[PDB]
């Protein structure tokens, strides 16, 4: 146990140290982001350590991608070989086609989970942040207080424990 060093962090450092190919490392990072990083995460088991572990995994993936990609590829491709511009544009089209704030939020959070650097190049990813966030904020903050807290609770799907 420990706030800044503990056994969970050590085990994940050893697990990360055993990743040699950019493909496996990026897959592990994407899976980790699905499993442990969002309100929509699959588990809160790592809630105290996941940010640090994700930073370690990001370092490993970034190093591997720099080794494996060429200058143009490092600038313009995701760690999975996709074209970052196409991925960003498709996500933005989906976001602009979003009907309500619930779909918009799923789109934005999924984009962050799938393409957060070092998966997508930082320039493309922060451009996506700009546009998708504009759309999400416009959908969310419209008529912010109209919905009663009871209806809002039902819409969020929150179980009242007290």
């Amino acid at each position: 146990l420990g706030i800044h060093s503990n056994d969970t962090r050590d085990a994940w450092v050893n697990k990360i140290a055993q990743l040699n190919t950019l493909e496996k490392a990026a897959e592990m990072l994407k899976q980790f982001r699905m499993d442990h990083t969002t309100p929509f995460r699959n588990s809160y088991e790592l809630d105290n350590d996941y940010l640090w572990i994700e930073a370690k995994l990001e370092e490993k993936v970034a190093v591997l991608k720099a080794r494996a990609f060429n200058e143009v590829d490092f600038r313009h491709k995701t760690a999975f070989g996709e074209d970052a511009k196409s991925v960003l544009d498709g996500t933005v089209a989906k976001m602009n086609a979003a009907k309500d704030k619930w779909e918009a939020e799923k789109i934005h959070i999924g984009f962050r989970q799938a393409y957060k650097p070092p998966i997508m190049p930082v320039n493309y990813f922060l451009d996506g942040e700009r546009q998708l966030g504009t759309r999400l904020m416009e959908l969310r903050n419209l008529n912010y207080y109209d919905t009663p807290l009871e209806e809002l609770r039902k819409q969020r799907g929150v179980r009242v424990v007290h």
């Binding site: 309100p39 904020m137 424990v161 007290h162």
Partner: protein
């Protein structure tokens, strides 16, 4: 062969608007519901050199006062110990507010399209760097020359042990830079600086003067001399967004969320730091808060923006209703958790209890009764083996951390707000002390995932947490935080270790 001529700042500033040119990607890099008009003017016609000269004059005044005459006067030592303890928190928390205001005005500088509005924001960026270094300098001076440097010397790493620092980060770090740039400008300029920070700086100078402190006035008056420009910045931000329809759709929601965010932390915390953190009282916090929020801010400053669509926050009445007892409830909680701080806390003494009863009728029968019980159990004596958190446990008064604001609250005990809301979402439980923060969470659950002290420290002994996070003094054993401000009988890490206090997650019972 001619008359001696120069050029002043305004003559250059005349053409600064034309400095920006049109091209396709000339747009803000940050998500925003609003569009700042590209013809917004700035009130103050500053260039970088003129700004440097103006600030350098003030800097010479202040640092000359500190280096020469206040040091000769021994002004760093001749301060009441309680105020020396209060100043650790005030200075370091204010320093994080200023530091984050640098990044926030950088985001605003990116967001503005008029070169003049950019210039105003840039001036504030430089000012916030100055203010960060001034507050840092307060802590540095009191560490070098004060009666107790611990906490003055390592607050940047010892703030992170206690719960008050999290809510401070909510209001003065993340509320300033995380979100819509206009929302951050409201959190910083319209609400944060106009409602609280400016009056707080002035009042802190008065309360430092009352308690023998001449360092804080010397620095904070100099800081306050800059704040008219920042008020103009916030005003110009509102003016620069007022002509687009997003303003009418979103501005009042953003303003209410900013106001509730800032007040939810500053209403209890500032009252606590004034009344319980001082020996000589200047003014009760009920009257100060009423004047600041309802009269100075909600009435005059907010009214000045009626023509631009701004209305008083709909939560202002709720804030007023919740404000009366909040800081006394909070001081109960903060004292009970004294070992997690980086400052020494004192119980209210007899004179203070009389003053509290005079100004807050009913204060004794609840708070003073609790404090006398804690005193009789030896909350101040290291050998008592008692820490007031144990009292909270024995009397079944769970302390919760608000999921959004990060403010500790004890709903079964608080004379003020006593609402507890616990939800479960995706295998995790969230606790809320008010409707506005809970709605904040329900609308944007991914904006609020901060872990509280109870979740981080769950299943850990208090002494282990204090040791790991450097809550010890230079000798290695005495705690920086103390339950009294006397010079003898300080608590050691061994005294805390003997209690065997283990942090439990309060939500686990649910």
């Amino acid at each position: 062969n001619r008359a001696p001529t120069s050029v002043n700042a305004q003559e250059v500033h005349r053409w600064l608007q034309s400095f920006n040119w049109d091209f396709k990607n000339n747009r803000t890099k940050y998500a925003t519901k609003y569009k700042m008009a590209n013809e917004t003017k700035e009130q103050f016609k500053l260039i970088a050199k003129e700004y440097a000269r103006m600030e350098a004059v003030k800097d010479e005044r202040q640092f000359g006062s500190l280096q020469d005459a206040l040091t000769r006067l021994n002004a760093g030592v001749r301060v009441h110990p309680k105020w020396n303890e209060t100043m650790k928190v005030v200075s370091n928390f204010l320093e994080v507010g200023e530091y984050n205001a640098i990044a926030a005005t950088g985001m605003l500088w990116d967001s503005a399209q008029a070169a003049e509005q950019k210039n105003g924001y840039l001036a504030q960026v430089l000012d916030e760097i100055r203010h960060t270094h001034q507050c840092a300098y307060v802590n540095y001076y009191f560490a070098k020359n004060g009666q107790d440097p611990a906490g003055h010397n390592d607050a940047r790493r010892t703030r992170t042990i206690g719960p008050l620092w999290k809510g401070m980060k909510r209001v003065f770090s993340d509320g300033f830079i995380s979100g819509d740039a206009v929302e951050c400008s409201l959190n910083l300029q319209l609400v944060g600086e106009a409602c609280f920070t400016n009056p707080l700086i002035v009042a802190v100078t008065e309360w430092a003067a009352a308690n023998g402190d001449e360092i804080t006035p010397t620095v904070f008056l100099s800081i306050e001399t800059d704040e008219l420009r920042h008020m103009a910045n916030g005003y110009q931000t509102v003016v620069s967004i007022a002509n687009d329809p997003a303003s009418a759709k979103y501005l009042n929601t953003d303003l209410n969320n900013a106001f509730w965010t800032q007040q939810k932390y500053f209403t209890p915390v500032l009252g606590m730091l004034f009344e319980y953190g001082s020996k000589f009282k200047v003014e009760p916090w009920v009257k100060t808060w009423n004047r600041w929020v309802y009269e100075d801010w909600g009435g005059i400053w907010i009214g000045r923006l009626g023509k631009y669509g701004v209305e008083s926050p709909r939560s202002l009445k709720d804030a007023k209703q919740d404000a009366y007892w909040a800081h006394h409830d909070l001081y109960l909680l903060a004292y009970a958790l004294w070992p997690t701080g980086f400052f020494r806390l004192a119980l209210p003494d007899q004179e203070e209890m009389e003053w509290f009863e005079a100004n807050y009728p009913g204060w004794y029968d609840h708070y003073g009764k609790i404090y006398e019980e804690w005193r009789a159990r030896g909350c101040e004596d290291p050998s008592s083996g008692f820490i007031p958190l144990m009292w909270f446990i024995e009397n079944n008064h769970p302390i919760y951390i608000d999921r959004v604001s990060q403010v500790p609250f004890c709903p079964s005990l608080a004379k003020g707000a006593s609402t507890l809301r616990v939800h479960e979402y995706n295998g995790q439980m969230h606790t809320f002390s008010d409707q506005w923060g809970e709605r904040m969470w329900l609308a944007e659950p991914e904006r609020y995932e901060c872990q509280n002290i109870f979740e981080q420290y769950e299943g850990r002994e208090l002494s282990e947490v204090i040791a790991e996070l450097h809550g010890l003094r230079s000798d290695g054993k005495t705690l920086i935080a103390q339950p009294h401000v006397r010079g003898d009988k300080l608590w050691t890490l061994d005294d805390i270790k003997r209690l065997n206090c283990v942090f439990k997650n309060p939500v686990k019972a649910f």
